[model samples]
Target: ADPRFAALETTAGARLGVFAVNTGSERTVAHRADERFPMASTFKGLACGALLREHPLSTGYFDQVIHYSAEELVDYSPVTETRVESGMTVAELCHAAITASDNTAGNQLLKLLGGPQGFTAFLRSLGDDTSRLDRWETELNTAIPGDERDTTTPAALAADYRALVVGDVLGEPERAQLTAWLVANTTGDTRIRAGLPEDWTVGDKTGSPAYGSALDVAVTWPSGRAPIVIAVLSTKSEQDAEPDNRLVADATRTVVDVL
Candidate 1:
């Protein structure tokens, strides 16, 4: 029973933007892939990749330690907030930022990468000219109406992820590590995870801020098939409109069913 994406968007009370492709094939699926949407927590994966560009895994950069005081943490940092006493390795922080959706973990990596502007530079450095990240976490997720402060299109997000995980920006070690973290992601359970088969290997990162902005970017490896990369971004019109995880989830199913 294939369904129209419009129906899913209507039910979720939001505009759903999606892009999906199997790297080994010429076929592609997309909707509003060129339009802008808030990035929110998804930037954490980019932040980690940017750091890896200069500090490749060969340098043991991720294994290096970063210690922060409790005061350095922002709200909703369950992972790093509790790790104040004992510093965490860059890899641990990256994992937490991407998988656990730890705000403090993401912010800490941003600091090492020289803040939001620096992170943006890294994306452009990777030849991603369309996306942008302008603020830190928590605040970066504000999702101001008609604001393009920290936003990216679905195609751009999917391409960037394909570059990082399937492209050459990072070494084999870092790529495997980053992909592993996403496969173990704890935040996007109801998003793309709800769409794909449980047995297939899926890796994804998610984001949600005020104003009904919700997002999920994923790479899935179906059994005996080439891996597929996807990005689903969503937003509602009303300020009070709530972001629906199911919107992102069903949107994923709609796209995957096509493939």
Candidate 2:
């Protein structure tokens, strides 16, 4: 284990999974990176890509409007703050889902994309079978009465992030748009980006379960250096979320400084 990551090892009931790769040298620092944990909203990243692929950018599918109903509303979502009758475009919902972590928007998008199975197929098509999207945002927001919940491993997420940003899984235009949404993600400042230097450019996605999980996966571009991909996944974390967030930040700092 890296000395800087010592704090994570001592965190009780916390399962820390980290994967960091230097884009230039392809050097990596992995700690329990293969372990799977609840993904929470992080699944939105893949869902967004799948949606864009199914409905090409030139088709203007994103411009089509969808109206919200009261039944679709959920807690912890910006969508709930708007009028139920007020309609929004698919692109707008995608933005809300990714940038703001809007649960309602995500659930709506999932419905449009053919639910959890659709996302599963998308991941499978990309050669990733380790992750699973088993339920909707509403189900995830609750205590989860059963075993069904979105899940992913740090390794799987890191590979997907690399594929989305630097690999050939997506077209140039879709990649550009997805990258923009990730860069604009406003949800995880205290986690993945907390320890990054001021000049670093980061695109990331964060996930948090109601009780005991916190996750952050990101692609970071350092000034004049190759982009670095890092994922920090924590399960059974403290309820307040500070410990989980700090764990990721600490690991991020170590990886950034060392590389």
**Candidate 2, residue 253: lDDT:** 85
Q: Candidate 1 vs. truth: CA RMSD?
A: 1.8
**Model 1 residue pairs with clashes:** none
lDDT string, candidate 2, 5-102, tens digits: 65655644566778888879999888878876677888887788888878878889989988888877887778545856778889888898899988
lDDT computed for candidate 1: 0.87
After TM-score superposition, the amount by which residue 94's alpha carbon in candidate 2 deviates from its true location, in angstroms, is: 0.6
Best by lDDT: 1
Residue-level lDDT tens digits of model 1 in 20-125: 9888894788888888988889898888888877798888788888988888889889889778998999989998899899999999999998888899998899
Q: In candidate 1, which residue ranges exceed 4 Å CA deviation? A: 1-3
True lDDT of residue 175, candidate 1: 88
Q: What TM-score fits each model?
A: 0.95, 0.91
Q: Give the TM-score of candidate 1.
A: 0.95
Error of 1 at 171 (Å): 0.8
